[PDB]
Amino acid sequence: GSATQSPGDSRRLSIQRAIQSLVHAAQCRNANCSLPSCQKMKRVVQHTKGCKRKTNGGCPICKQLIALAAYHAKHCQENKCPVPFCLNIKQK
């Protein structure tokens, strides 16, 4: 009757949803979405594709995105993966 799950489990679902939005927006360049998550995520994903500033250090926004993708890249060896970070972490 709690439905709170174990602390590690509950934080795992929520963190995976963040990754699933990064995966969504990496594949998603369509205008057919009107939800807030997709709008901010496509904003930052198309940004990270045109952002040399992230490896140049002066961009904390992409530091968040690479943190999801790093943890995710430890488990995911996918060479066809939508997320550009995920490859650039586990390949290099």
């Binding site: 963040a18 807030p36 998550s37 943190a67």
Partner: peptide
């Protein structure tokens, strides 16, 4: 607008406190 984006994401995921 970038730190506003960063805000949406920071609340979207927990992550380690680092």
């Amino acid at each position: 607008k970038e730190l506003s984006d960063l805000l949406d994401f920071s609340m979207m995921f927990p992550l380690p406190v680092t």
